[PDB]
């Protein structure tokens, strides 16, 4: 008829308040014969023999609730772990009260640990509530702590699953270093300015000093950290105007202990209304049997419903944390902490105090600086990308067309040849053609400059397993775009299902089908329906570009896998190699798009296309994810579609014949 409560507490005043709350816990519960005894222990400068003394004293005491209430620990590890582990050896709930580490969030590791505080990742949820107020969609994550970094990124992806958006850049590395400045300069080149930081005080002061040396406290920069990053020398290195968080009654020890005693007491008086009430035996000497109502009492703690307390309502969720906590939002006004907001269970209310920013105005900084210099990557398309070496040094020969129009070239940068032939010989030459003048029209339309460069290979890009770690990766223009080295694939890119799963698309500019290049008895093929090409031989040589999207499109078509096993013996790197081989009568057929071969038939009259016109598809501009260059650019493309500018581009190259 007795219940023991164990605690690790040092100060005699909080021990007296703890014993007074234990004595007053049986006040309003009538004249029932239950008794509540309390046992508190102090601290030894070590941690192993502390764990030993506490664990065997609470085994000999047979307590039901174990409390740790020491925020000023001299060790910066903040680990009450071994007492909770020894209680989890017999499945006894330990109620942690001070630390907020996410490693305690794992119920698989911490089988019988509960706490009345949330981890810091929920603060990012509050920062997700910052995404619901100021209409922000691109963040920059920086976490040094690898113990909580995976859980923080998992919670971040869970929060961004509702919007189905992704973070722009995430970083995890070893704490204690000082060169993170190159990563900060790479973050400077990004569009967003949202700085999310999750580390200790040393790494926070290091990145504050690194941002102060780079002078990242200008206009548009978003600064948003927590309570751990505004203490110690990080408070000395703190730039003004920074927006931080504050835990309401997180440091207030006495009311937290009183609320914990109320929660434990009402949980015990709820558990006394049930049967199958087992007791943990003397497990120190000759008793390794587990406490049989471990998960039962844990489920009793799962259904803990409350309506009274000092601060607010307390309830344990599927993770065992405190919900609906009130937070404070502080601002650093000239190295002075000024409160600028309050936070309810789910809602933010800024007060009448102004929001002073480190940059310019007091309104929200529109920190999405879009790319005004687009790194344009392209592949060498023969009717679209005409590449010519310069005359003397970086100049373009302004040749005139037959319509009185000078050719508007561009200084592109490209290699000589492929990697076995020419490994690294990249020069700036002059590029012009269809998509070059299309990009010139886009630059005339919108507010941007650009940077035209080429791709290192002659391939679009296919998904293939890299030989280490058994992972499928990309290459080509998709491999260079997703690496961040490029900005916009301006190329006749093959639109299919697999590419749209990873990036976003625009409206297609080119619309054409598929055909067969032959040379001119039926010398023609009449498309795919030739029965001699269904079961091929060494006579009719049909082939395609190596690592092309037509190969993937025919790889999905499992009913013509024999053509998949036939073109693999004759895969060519570029289409110009196929033109050179079919002019010298080494090839016999070539699956390729319609209008390119029609232009080559206008070049050379012996080139003949086939009769069947299948897979009438469209080619557009390769794009990034959700970006401010999506809606404006698609409206500009549609404006180019509605007028006769497509006919003008036909008059440049397509409609003209030779």
């Amino acid at each position: 008829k007795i219940v023991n409560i164990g605690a690790v507490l040092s100060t005699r005043k909080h021990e007296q308040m703890f014993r007074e709350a234990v004595n007053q816990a049986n006040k309003r519960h009538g004249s029932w014969k239950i008794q509540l005894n309390a046992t508190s222990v102090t601290h030894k400068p070590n941690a192993i023999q502390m764990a030993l003394s506490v664990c065997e004293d609470l085994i000999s005491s047979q307590v039901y609730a174990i409390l740790v209430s020491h925020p000023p620990t001299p060790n910066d590890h903040f680990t009450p772990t071994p007492v909770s582990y020894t209680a989890g050896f017999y499945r006894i709930p330990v109620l942690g009260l001070t630390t907020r580490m996410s490693i305690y969030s794992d119920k698989s590791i911490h089988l019988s640990f509960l706490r009345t505080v949330p981890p810091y990742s929920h603060q990012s949820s509050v920062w997700f509530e910052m995404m619901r107020v100021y209409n922000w969609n691109h963040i920059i994550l920086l976490v040094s702590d690898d113990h909580e970094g995976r859980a923080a990124q998992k919670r971040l992806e869970t929060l961004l699953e509702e919007r189905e958006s992704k973070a722009e850049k995430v970083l995890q590395f070893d704490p204690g270093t000082k060169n993170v400045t190159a990563l900060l300069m790479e973050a400077r080149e990004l569009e967003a300015r949202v700085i999310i930081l999750s580390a200790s005080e040393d790494d926070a002061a290091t990145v504050y000093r690194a941002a102060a040396m780079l002078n990242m406290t200008g206009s548009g920069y978003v600064w948003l950290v927590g309570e751990r990053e505004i203490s110690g020398n990080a408070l000395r290195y703190a730039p003004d105007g920074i927006i931080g968080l504050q835990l309401i009654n997180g440091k207030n020890e006495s009311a937290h202990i009183s609320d914990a005693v109320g929660v434990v007491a009402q949980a015990v008086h709820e558990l006394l209304e049930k049967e199958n009430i087992t007791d943990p035996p003397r497990g120190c000497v000759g008793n390794t049997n587990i406490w049989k109502t471990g998960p039962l009492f844990k489920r009793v703690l799962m259904s803990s419903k409350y309506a009274d307390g000092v601060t607010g309502r307390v309830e344990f969720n599927e993770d065992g944390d405190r919900k609906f906590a009130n937070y404070s939002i502080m601002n650093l006004q000239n190295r002075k902490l000024v409160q600028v907001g309050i936070y309810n269970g789910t809602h933010v209310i800024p007060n009448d105090r102004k929001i002073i920013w480190p940059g310019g105005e007091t309104e929200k900084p529109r920190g999405y600086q879009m790319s005004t210099r687009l790194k344009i990557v392209t592949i060498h398309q023969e009717p679209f990308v005409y590449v010519k070496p310069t005359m003397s040094d970086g100049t373009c020969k302004e040749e005139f067309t037959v319509n009185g129009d000078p050719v508007k070239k561009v200084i592109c940068t490209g290699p000589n040849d492929t990697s076995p032939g020419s490994p690294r010989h990249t020069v700036p030459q002059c590029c012009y053609g269809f998509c070059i003048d299309l990009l010139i029209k886009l630059a005339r339309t919108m507010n941007f400059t650009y940077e035209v460069h080429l791709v290192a290979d002659g391939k679009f890009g296919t998904q293939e397993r890299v030989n280490n770690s058994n992972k499928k990766e990309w290459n080509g223009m998709m491999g260079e775009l997703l690496s961040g080295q490029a900005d916009m694939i301006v190329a006749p890119l093959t639109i299919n299902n697999e590419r749209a799963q990873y990036i976003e698309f625009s409206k297609p500019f080119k619309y054409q089908g598929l055909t067969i290049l032959v040379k001119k008895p039926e010398e023609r093929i009449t498309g795919i329906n030739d029965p001699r090409l269904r079961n091929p031989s060494d006579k009719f040589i049909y082939a395609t570009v190596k690592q092309s999207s037509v190969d993937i499109y025919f790889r999905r078509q499992v009913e013509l896998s024999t053509m998949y096993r036939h073109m693999e013996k004759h895969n060519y790197e570029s289409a110009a190699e196929a033109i050179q081989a079919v002019r010298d009568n080494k090839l016999h057929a070539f699956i390729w798009d319609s209008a390119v071969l029609e232009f080559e038939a206008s070049q050379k009259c012996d080139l003949v296309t086939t009769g069947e016109l299948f897979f009438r598809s469209g080619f557009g501009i390769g794009m990034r994810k959700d970006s401010p260059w999506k809606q404006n650019v698609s409206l500009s493309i549609l404006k180019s579609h509605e007028n006769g500018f497509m006919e003008d581009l036909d008059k440049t190259w397509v409609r003209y014949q030779e």
Partner: protein
């Protein structure tokens, strides 16, 4: 597949009847294969306002008036695409290559 059509009796009253009719063709097969793949539930009916869409003093008509004013969800049937229609709603990717032409003898 069945559908309804709100056919009015006269011009004297606005009261009509929802006559149920059958439909087949291209877009019917497209919608049936979408129901095979996605495995959802659809609510198919016909519009009685008129043609595709035309704004008369910030008032659209037809399928544009049904979709933009949110009396429906999506337009599966045939619809031309221009600038302001792409401004008011979000079209999908194009699947069929249908332009304009001139019929002569």
């Amino acid at each position: 597949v069945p559908c309804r059509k709100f056919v009015k009796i006269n011009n004297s009253t606005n009261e009509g009847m929802n006559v149920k009719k059958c439909c087949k063709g291209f877009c019917i097969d497209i919608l049936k294969k979408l129901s095979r793949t996605v495995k959802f539930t659809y609510d198919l009916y016909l519009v009685t306002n008129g043609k595709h869409g035309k704004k008369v003093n910030n008032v659209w008509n037809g399928m544009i008036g049904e979709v933009v004013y949110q009396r429906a969800v999506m337009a599966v049937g045939s619809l031309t695409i221009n600038e302001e229609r792409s401004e008011v709603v979000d079209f999908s990717v194009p699947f069929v290559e249908t332009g304009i032409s001139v019929m002569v003898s």
